[PDB]
A paper describes a structure:
The enzyme is comprised of two rotary motors, termed F1 and Fo, that are coupled together by two stalks: a central “rotor” stalk and a peripheral “stator” stalk. The Fo motor spans the membrane and converts the potential energy from the pmf into mechanical rotation of the central rotor that, in turn, drives conformational changes in the catalytic F1 motor subunits to generate ATP from ADP and inorganic phosphate (Pi). Here we have used cryo-Electron Microscopy (cryo-EM) on detergent-solubilized cysteine free E. coli ATP synthase13 to probe its structure and understand its rotational dynamics and coupling.
Focused classification of rotational State 1 highlighted five sub-classes, here termed Sub-states 1A, 1B, 1C, 1D, and 1E; with resolutions of 3.1, 3.3, 3.1, 3.2, and 3.3 Å, respectively. The defining theme of these sub-states was flexing of the central and peripheral stalks, with the majority of the flexibility seen in the peripheral stalk which bends and twists, together with minor movements within the central stalk. Independently, the movements seen between Sub-states 1B-E do not facilitate rotation of the c10 ring and instead illustrate torsional flexing of the entire complex. Sub-state 1A was in one rotational sub-state (here termed Sub-state 1’), whereas Sub-states 1B-E were rotated by a single c subunit relative to Sub-state 1’ (here termed Sub-state 1”). In State 1 the un-stretched spring corresponds to an Fo rotation angle in-between two of its 10 preferred rotational sub-states. The maps presented here were generated from material imaged in the presence of 10 mM MgADP and all showed the enzyme in the “autoinhibited” state, with the C-terminal domain of the ε subunit (εCTD) in the “up” inhibited position interacting with the F1 catalytic subunits. In the cryo-EM maps of the intact F1Fo enzyme in the presence of 10 mM MgADP, all α subunits contained ATP and Mg2+, whereas the contents of the β subunits varied: β1 bound ADP, Mg2+ and Pi, β2 bound only ADP, and β3 bound ADP and Mg2+.
Numbering used by the authors:
A (entry chain Q), B (entry chain I), C (entry chain P), D (entry chain L), E (entry chain O), F (entry chain J), ...: 3 to 79
J (entry chain R): 3 to 78
K (entry chain a): 4 to 269
L (entry chain Y), M (entry chain X): 1 to 52
N (entry chain H): 3 to 69
The structure:
Amino acid sequence: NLNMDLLYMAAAVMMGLAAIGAAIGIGILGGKFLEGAARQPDLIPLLRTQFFIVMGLVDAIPMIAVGLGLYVMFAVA
Amino acid sequence: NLNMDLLYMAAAVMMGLAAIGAAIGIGILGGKFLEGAARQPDLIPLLRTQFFIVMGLVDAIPMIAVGLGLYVMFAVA
Amino acid sequence: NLNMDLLYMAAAVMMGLAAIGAAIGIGILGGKFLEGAARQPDLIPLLRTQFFIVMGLVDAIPMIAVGLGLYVMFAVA
Amino acid sequence: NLNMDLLYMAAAVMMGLAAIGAAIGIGILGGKFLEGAARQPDLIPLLRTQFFIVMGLVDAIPMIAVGLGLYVMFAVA
Amino acid sequence: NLNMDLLYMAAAVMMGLAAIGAAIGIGILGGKFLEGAARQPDLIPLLRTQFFIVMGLVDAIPMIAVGLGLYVMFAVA
Amino acid sequence: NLNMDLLYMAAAVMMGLAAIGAAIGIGILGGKFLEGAARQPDLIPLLRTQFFIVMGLVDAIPMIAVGLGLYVMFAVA
Amino acid sequence: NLNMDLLYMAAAVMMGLAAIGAAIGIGILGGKFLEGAARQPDLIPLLRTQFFIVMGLVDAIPMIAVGLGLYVMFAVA
Amino acid sequence: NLNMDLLYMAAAVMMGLAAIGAAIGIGILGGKFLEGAARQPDLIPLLRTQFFIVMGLVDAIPMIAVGLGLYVMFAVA
Amino acid sequence: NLNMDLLYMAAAVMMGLAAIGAAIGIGILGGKFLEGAARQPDLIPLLRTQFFIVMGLVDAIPMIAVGLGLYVMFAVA
Amino acid sequence: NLNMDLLYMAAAVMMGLAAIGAAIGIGILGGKFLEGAARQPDLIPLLRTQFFIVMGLVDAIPMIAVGLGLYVMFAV
Amino acid sequence: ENMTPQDYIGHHLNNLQLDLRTFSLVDPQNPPATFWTINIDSMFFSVVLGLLFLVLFRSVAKKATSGVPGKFQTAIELVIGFVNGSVKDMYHGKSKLIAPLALTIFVWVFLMNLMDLLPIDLLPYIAEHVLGLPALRVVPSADVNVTLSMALGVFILILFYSIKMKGIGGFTKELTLQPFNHWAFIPVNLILEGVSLLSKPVSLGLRLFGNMYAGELIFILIAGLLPWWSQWILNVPWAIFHILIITLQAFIFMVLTIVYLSMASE
Amino acid sequence: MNLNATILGQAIAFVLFVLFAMKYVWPPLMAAIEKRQKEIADGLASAERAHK
Amino acid sequence: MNLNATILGQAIAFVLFVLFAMKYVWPPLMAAIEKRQKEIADGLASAERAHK
Amino acid sequence: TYHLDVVSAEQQMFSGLVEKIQVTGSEGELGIYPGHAPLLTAIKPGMIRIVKQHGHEEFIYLSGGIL
């Protein structure tokens, strides 16, 4: 029955690192975006579009590692 | 027994790493927000709007990790 | 035997990580608060209100980690 | 048999590390991308071109790692 | 019993992490203080006011941390 | 038998570290390249040509770790 | 025996993390100080005062941690 | 026996960390060299000389770790 | 041969972490020394004396860490 | 048997941490050096000299870590 | 067909190797020990792709004209444009060989990689169930030895060009004095500079290789691990992306070749 | 396991991949070629106007 | 995976595919283009003398 | 050496070759040597230090300006 604890520990690492990656990427990107917004507030509705169109491309891999941890926990037990 | 009493180490790894991610990302975003505000000290409410927009994206994946940490600690354990 | 002795370790993981996160998330924001304030000292009372509004989200999620760490540390161990 | 656990734990680390590495490498680049966009908003497409050219490099090792993690988790087992 | 060395280490983890967090956060904030000071040396008492006033906030969580590590190393161990 | 569980792990960790290193380094290098692009169009080809003097050098060590990691995972085990 | 065994490891984490933090923090701080001095050789002493004052706040937690390490290596040994 | 596992682990970590070191150390340096060129392309062939004279050092430690990892593979196994 | 094995991991941890701390903390400082040089060449002697005086702080804790490393390695062994 | 791979692992960790440190430090210092040079190109010699002087103090502890890592790896 | 997914996957991890003593075919289940067992699948693809590049080019080369080019000729001259544009600025010496070196590297590597987009199982089927061949795989670069041979060829060239264009008398000085220049450090200096030389061909080989080994792996898994109505939906994005890597790695190899040599000779 | 279903899967995959290539990737190829040919052709045309 | 004697055969194939391009493909290809490069370069000097 | 021009809106105050100068830039005190990278900054009221080639020093008082 040791198996069914390390099966959760793998999910612990697998889904902690993913949260860190997502948070860091989005935070840096949003910070630079906000500086761009503040230096020209007339321009926001363009920069924000570009922001989302990039941000998805960061979070791609967090959201697959999350998924594999979800699989290992809920399905594999 | 350890077959449950170690689950807390899994929850700890998961949710503490998530705490790091959300804390650092939110802090960076807020720092650029404050600089922008100080440099446009009338534009603020629109910047606060956008700050709240991109803020939750930093916590989009940390919140799932919180959910699953409390899952391991109060559904499983 | 394996009940309390590793619960100390796991709560220590949770709360030490949350301490790293909550120290640096305050640190960076405070740095940008100071350096911006040093340029616009006449606006300080507005800036600090924005500071507190931001920190309210910064530390909310580490607060979970530490309060949960106490819920483990005193009750469960 | 026990053998399933350690393989899962090995793959988990690869996928978490890939997640963090990729996410940071894209967030930094996108940050500079957007702060540039806020200067040359008319020439966004050219920046997008070179941005994706380089993002083709950022993702190399992280997705090598995601592939090997999937292989370990589902065919080494 | 074997737990004696486990209590020491379970405290030591939280102690080292509190050290790292507090040191980095306060170093950052002080660095911005020292730079800001060079511009308007007429302001340094007000800057130092703000510095202490937020540095009281930098360390709250590490001041949970070291306290509760000693709660083991000098009472419970 | 015990050799599998850790002969795969060694490659998992080795290639995860190889991922982090190159992802971060190329992130920053490309970030500065886009700084150049947004500041100084009409140089973009020259900057690209120089940038790819460095980009190969950034991969210098990590790709060796990825090759040896594949060796470990398929020839050693 | 083991009472004799883990009193080196237990101090290893503490003293290593403390030695990292107390060096990083004041590297940051003294760097900002040193440039602030290069920009204003009129204010070398005035800023040196603040450098010491502010340093006084960083090394608190590192000194506690490393002192407790020395404690575990020679007092309780 | 498992000495093969842990000796290959020794090679694994030896190379793994040096990879991150030598990647990020060049990422930083190239990142500054690129902007130095960006402001003024007519200095490129000078800065791209001093660049090599600098980067020569960055590898002195990691390309020791590289060779010793290869040795620990093919001599120590 | 059991009882002493951990002294050789414990001797490595405290050494390596002091190495990282000292090197990174003095680099982050030497960078500002070099800027203070390049803005004012004829101040370079005074800034070098200031650099030494500051670095006398940074290296403090690392020296203690490495000293107790020497202790554990050769005296304790 | 169960022991010696511990020594080898410890020497690998020594060199790994020391490489991380002595690479990041030299990289930061080198980036600032290159930009300082790009600012005052005709003080390249003076800056390179003082850069060596400041570098020397960075490498000490990592090089000692490599020394003791080699001693652990081969003298024991 | 008793192939478990874990087991089916294996057959693509398997090469179709020769044994030169026996000219025999090395069966997948038992791998003979020796250094004398050629990888036929990598070789046949290598030579066929190289030749069908050279044919397309040399057919027009004999015929090239200064009128408006034929469209096929237009593409030939446009890739000549990218190639000559790179050569034109990164190289400054007289040597002839540099340009066709870089060209034959670029397009040939691209072709060796180009195959990966081929449906992963298709051609191994005509290998096994038609011509009676026990196993196969269809990306040469995913077989280490070609990348090793090419990058160590560049290694030979680094030695060769550098010694040609500055001699041993200065080559020893560089290889021994640097980076600290002070005579007590020389023995330790050369150690650090030596493998610093060798890691260039090694990294050239490995950076390319790993990308394509791991490229094929994802298609192997796409085939093995998923139902028909989901193998296509990951494969759309994965092709969208792998376009990029298979182009970038050839461009990298070209530029890196030229740069590595230029640093030594110029 | 049945080897056949992978065939239908990779058929769908390759068909849609080729749609992507043709509709998005062949146009830029042919367009850069046509652009280069325009440059060559008008170059020779104006050269001949100059030689007139 | 496995080291192989392929590592020499590929050098043998490589240097030959190099030779077949060196003395027989690139000089023709670029020379036929140099002819054109001149032939559009001359038009400017032609009109220049016509102007003078 | 490099050529230094100190000019007011009214009349010209210096022109000759210089080895180095030291100027109190608004952000920080700065020093310029031959080949210095292009730079542009305000400056605070105060002195400016010249060394005319062959090292001959002199000082000038300014009400501010732009360098």
